[PDB]
Design an enzyme around this catalytic site. Structure first.
Site, PDB file in Angstrom:
ATOM      1  N   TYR A   1      55.372  56.861  38.164  1.00 47.89           N
ATOM      2  CA  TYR A   1      55.842  58.022  37.361  1.00 47.89           C
ATOM      3  C   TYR A   1      54.799  58.396  36.297  1.00 47.89           C
ATOM      4  O   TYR A   1      55.006  59.425  35.601  1.00 47.89           O
ATOM      5  CB  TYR A   1      57.184  57.702  36.698  1.00 47.89           C
ATOM      6  CG  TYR A   1      58.261  57.160  37.607  1.00 47.89           C
ATOM      7  CD1 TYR A   1      58.521  57.711  38.856  1.00 47.89           C
ATOM      8  CD2 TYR A   1      59.072  56.124  37.182  1.00 47.89           C
ATOM      9  CE1 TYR A   1      59.541  57.229  39.661  1.00 47.89           C
ATOM     10  CE2 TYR A   1      60.098  55.633  37.972  1.00 47.89           C
ATOM     11  CZ  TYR A   1      60.332  56.182  39.217  1.00 47.89           C
ATOM     12  OH  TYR A   1      61.340  55.673  39.986  1.00 47.89           O
TER      13      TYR A   1
ATOM     14  N   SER B   1      52.537  56.739  32.841  1.00 45.21           N
ATOM     15  CA  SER B   1      52.892  55.920  31.652  1.00 45.21           C
ATOM     16  C   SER B   1      54.190  56.472  31.066  1.00 45.21           C
ATOM     17  O   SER B   1      54.118  57.379  30.211  1.00 45.21           O
ATOM     18  CB  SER B   1      51.792  55.911  30.628  1.00 45.21           C
ATOM     19  OG  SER B   1      50.552  55.660  31.263  1.00 45.21           O
TER      20      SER B   1
ATOM     21  N   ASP C   1      58.256  66.689  39.248  1.00 44.56           N
ATOM     22  CA  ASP C   1      56.980  66.439  39.942  1.00 44.56           C
ATOM     23  C   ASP C   1      56.263  65.336  39.191  1.00 44.56           C
ATOM     24  O   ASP C   1      55.829  65.581  38.061  1.00 44.56           O
ATOM     25  CB  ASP C   1      56.151  67.708  40.055  1.00 44.56           C
ATOM     26  CG  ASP C   1      54.990  67.537  41.027  1.00 44.56           C
ATOM     27  OD1 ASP C   1      54.630  66.371  41.335  1.00 44.56           O
ATOM     28  OD2 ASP C   1      54.478  68.546  41.471  1.00 44.56           O
TER      29      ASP C   1
HETATM   30  N1  LIG Z   1      60.554  58.385  35.687  1.00 45.77           N
HETATM   31  C1  LIG Z   1      61.540  59.125  35.190  1.00 45.77           C
HETATM   32  C2  LIG Z   1      61.501  60.130  34.233  1.00 45.77           C
HETATM   33  C3  LIG Z   1      60.251  60.676  33.715  1.00 45.77           C
HETATM   34  O1  LIG Z   1      59.169  60.260  34.117  1.00 45.77           O
HETATM   35  N2  LIG Z   1      60.373  61.662  32.831  1.00 45.77           N
HETATM   36  C4  LIG Z   1      59.219  62.312  32.237  1.00 45.77           C
HETATM   37  C5  LIG Z   1      58.733  63.469  33.071  1.00 45.77           C
HETATM   38  C6  LIG Z   1      57.800  64.353  32.561  1.00 45.77           C
HETATM   39  C7  LIG Z   1      57.356  65.427  33.306  1.00 45.77           C
HETATM   40  C8  LIG Z   1      57.846  65.651  34.591  1.00 45.77           C
HETATM   41  C9  LIG Z   1      57.419  66.794  35.454  1.00 45.77           C
HETATM   42  O2  LIG Z   1      58.077  67.088  36.441  1.00 45.77           O
HETATM   43  N3  LIG Z   1      56.300  67.461  35.111  1.00 45.77           N
HETATM   44  C10 LIG Z   1      55.723  68.502  35.948  1.00 45.77           C
HETATM   45  C11 LIG Z   1      56.008  69.901  35.413  1.00 45.77           C
HETATM   46  C12 LIG Z   1      57.452  70.335  35.544  1.00 45.77           C
HETATM   47  C13 LIG Z   1      57.839  70.624  37.005  1.00 45.77           C
HETATM   48  C14 LIG Z   1      57.436  72.024  37.444  1.00 45.77           C
HETATM   49  C15 LIG Z   1      57.872  72.333  38.879  1.00 45.77           C
HETATM   50  C16 LIG Z   1      59.366  72.150  39.048  1.00 45.77           C
HETATM   51  C17 LIG Z   1      59.786  70.753  38.628  1.00 45.77           C
HETATM   52  C18 LIG Z   1      59.340  70.446  37.203  1.00 45.77           C
HETATM   53  C19 LIG Z   1      54.212  68.314  36.024  1.00 45.77           C
HETATM   54  O3  LIG Z   1      53.458  69.192  35.626  1.00 45.77           O
HETATM   55  N4  LIG Z   1      53.791  67.141  36.479  1.00 45.77           N
HETATM   56  C20 LIG Z   1      52.400  66.723  36.406  1.00 45.77           C
HETATM   57  C21 LIG Z   1      51.637  67.051  37.665  1.00 45.77           C
HETATM   58  C22 LIG Z   1      52.232  67.743  38.704  1.00 45.77           C
HETATM   59  C23 LIG Z   1      51.494  68.018  39.842  1.00 45.77           C
HETATM   60  N5  LIG Z   1      50.218  67.657  40.000  1.00 45.77           N
HETATM   61  C24 LIG Z   1      49.653  66.991  38.987  1.00 45.77           C
HETATM   62  C25 LIG Z   1      50.316  66.671  37.818  1.00 45.77           C
HETATM   63  C26 LIG Z   1      58.784  64.765  35.105  1.00 45.77           C
HETATM   64  C27 LIG Z   1      59.220  63.691  34.359  1.00 45.77           C
HETATM   65  C28 LIG Z   1      62.841  60.519  34.060  1.00 45.77           C
HETATM   66  N6  LIG Z   1      63.662  59.841  34.851  1.00 45.77           N
HETATM   67  N7  LIG Z   1      62.839  58.994  35.557  1.00 45.77           N
HETATM   68  C29 LIG Z   1      63.403  58.159  36.567  1.00 45.77           C
HETATM   69  C30 LIG Z   1      63.898  56.903  36.233  1.00 45.77           C
HETATM   70  C31 LIG Z   1      64.299  56.035  37.235  1.00 45.77           C
HETATM   71  C32 LIG Z   1      64.215  56.414  38.560  1.00 45.77           C
HETATM   72  C33 LIG Z   1      63.742  57.670  38.890  1.00 45.77           C
HETATM   73  C34 LIG Z   1      63.336  58.549  37.898  1.00 45.77           C
END
Ligand SMILES: Nc1c(C(=O)NCc2ccc(C(=O)N[C@@H](CCC3CCCCC3)C(=O)NCc3ccncc3)cc2)cnn1-c1ccccc1
Length: 338
Positions: A31, A33, A164
């Site tokens: 995921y 850090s 993502d």
């Molecule tokens: N590990 C985690 C979290 C966590 O980690 N939260 C923090 C977090 C921060 C940002 C993002 C994120 O998605 N950033 C997205 C942007 C938002 C998107 C846009 C498109 C539509 C979807 C949203 C993003 O830019 N990525 C970086 C990236 C993407 C693609 N290429 C390279 C880099 C996701 C999570 C929460 N719950 N869990 C969990 C716990 C246990 C089991 C399973 C899951």
């Protein structure tokens, strides 16, 4: 400006507001850090992500800006949202670290499918939520492009969010039209991925486990058949067109003979998602109205997104510019209501 405290978690420094307690690293790298934490303001578990080397290069800086712009935009029950974003930096000069806070999800769909065999009811509800999230993302002219079971997370109530995690092969869930490199693709690349995901939820098996982009393409054509004249006429790339037309012709399979014993309504929707011709593929908004979702579908409760200013994507700026723009977004952030 709140009071921060420092600690060292698995070879990483963390400087977080005291409002976030009991930081516990999760996912052993899958995921990024990321720590689970207890948020003393709400009384809820949260996830805190420290961006790795966010301003190391123009490309890291632009990626950092992009992630923050996307997270600040997303306000939907089936898309990850931003609870908080902070930096220990008191000024733009000192600004070098970005922390994102989201809901803590319970499990990814990869773990769910690998660990459990899913019922048709659970498949209906999980795919409905993905499509409802996609309708919202697509309405903002955002394409996920990376949809796969590890990018979908579920709580014990089966409430799903699209995320993502960045860098289960992406390849396996990727639309044929963005398999060989080119620009003839729309939002429906994400609907192909949803079809591959739904197939795997129904069967327990990766539908198209290609070893590479060529193998992947061969496995796809074996189900959906080689393109006719109609689709061949729309392929600009001589080299792609030569590859496809170099294959021995293959008929479209009867999906009812592949997904034997599945709900026929599930088989009908899968036929509408796994179409080679991306102009003929069902959209998220269309799919939500499919008779498969009759139990869940509420046209008054499938909202679209505010417009999203993607105009930065075309811009070529310096690290310090992307850094300043990111700093602006940190400062202007308004938390959602408690
Ligand atoms: N590990 C985690 C979290 C966590 O980690 N939260 C923090 C977090 C921060 C940002 C993002 C994120 O998605 N950033 C997205 C942007 C938002 C998107 C846009 C498109 C539509 C979807 C949203 C993003 O830019 N990525 C970086 C990236 C993407 C693609 N290429 C390279 C880099 C996701 C999570 C929460 N719950 N869990 C969990 C716990 C246990 C089991 C399973 C899951």
């Amino acid at each position: 400006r709140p009071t921060f405290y420092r600690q060292e978690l698995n070879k990483t420094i963390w400087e977080v507001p005291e409002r976030y307690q009991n930081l516990s690293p999760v996912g052993s790298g899958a995921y990024g850090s990321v720590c689970a934490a207890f948020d003393t303001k709400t009384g809820h578990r949260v996830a805190v992500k420290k961006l790795s080397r966010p301003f190391q290069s123009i490309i890291h800086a632009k990626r950092t800006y992009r992630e923050l712009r996307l997270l600040k935009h997303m306000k939907h029950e089936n898309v990850i949202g931003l609870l908080d974003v902070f930096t220990p930096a008191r000024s733009l000069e000192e600004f070098n670290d970005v922390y994102l806070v989201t809901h803590l999800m319970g499990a990814d769909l990869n773990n769910i499918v690998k660990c459990q065999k899913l019922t048709d009811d659970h498949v209906q509800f999980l795919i409905y939520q993905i499509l409802r999230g996609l309708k919202y993302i697509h309405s903002a002219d955002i394409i996920h492009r990376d949809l796969k079971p590890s990018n979908l997370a579920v709580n014990e109530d089966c409430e799903l969010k699209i995320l993502d995690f960045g860098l289960v092969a992406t390849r396996w869930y990727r639309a044929p039209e963005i398999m060989l490199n080119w620009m003839h693709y729309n939002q429906t690349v994400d609907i192909w991925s949803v079809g591959c995901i739904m197939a795997e939820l129904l069967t327990g098996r990766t539908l198209f486990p290609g070893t590479d982009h060529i193998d992947q393409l061969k496995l796809i054509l074996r189900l959906v058949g080689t393109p006719g004249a109609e689709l061949l006429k729309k392929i600009s790339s001589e080299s792609a067109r030569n590859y496809i037309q170099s294959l021995a012709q293959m008929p479209k399979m009867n999906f009812a003979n592949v997904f034997i014993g599945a709900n026929p309504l599930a088989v009908d929707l899968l036929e509408k998602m796994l179409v080679l011709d991306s102009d003929k593929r069902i959209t998220a908004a269309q799919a939500l109205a499919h008779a498969y979702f009759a139990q869940y579908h509420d046209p008054d409760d499938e909202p679209v997104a505010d417009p999203y200013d993607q105009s930065f994507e075309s811009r070529d700026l310096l690290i310090d510019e992307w850094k300043s723009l990111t700093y602006d977004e940190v400062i202007s952030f308004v938390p959602p209501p408690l």
